[PDB]
């Protein structure tokens, strides 16, 4: 079965940093692009970042200049490095493979469970 497992959440102070990771299994992780999406309590879904299958091109949302997206295809692991975290960044962070006929080409839609990050 296909799984995406987020970890590395927790509580940090404003101006601090936190590195999140998502372990992938059950599918050809290294052939797909990957997305990060976050959702704060009381709000809707917010797209954060996207990285291509080869770890080459990177795209960012509100977070550009602070967050960095990367991956290691030998470990099937997706990373998100968040620096200069603000109170506004409190959210549940999901890793996902979003069905996309234009850019990633993914024909299947997968989501993790999400990890909570609190800034205070």
């Amino acid at each position: 079965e296909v799984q995406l497992v987020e970890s590395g959440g927790g509580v940090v102070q404003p101006g601090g940093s936190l590195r999140l990771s998502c372990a992938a299994s059950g599918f050809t992780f290294n052939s797909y692009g990957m997305h990060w999406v976050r959702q704060a309590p009381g709000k809707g879904l917010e797209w954060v970042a996207f990285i291509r299958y080869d770890g080459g091109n990177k795209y960012y949302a509100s977070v550009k200049g602070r967050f960095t997206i990367s991956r290691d295809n030998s470990k099937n692991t997706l990373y998100l490095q968040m620096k200069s975290l603000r109170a506004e960044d409190t959210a549940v962070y999901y890793c996902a493979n979003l069905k996309d006929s234009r850019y990633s080409g993914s024909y299947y839609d997968y989501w993790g469970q999400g990890t909570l990050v609190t800034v205070s």
Binding site: F50, D100, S101
Partner: peptide, 9 residues
Amino acid sequence: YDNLPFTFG
């Protein structure tokens, strides 16, 4: 998903 960044309603 017409173009990046992607957005939700």
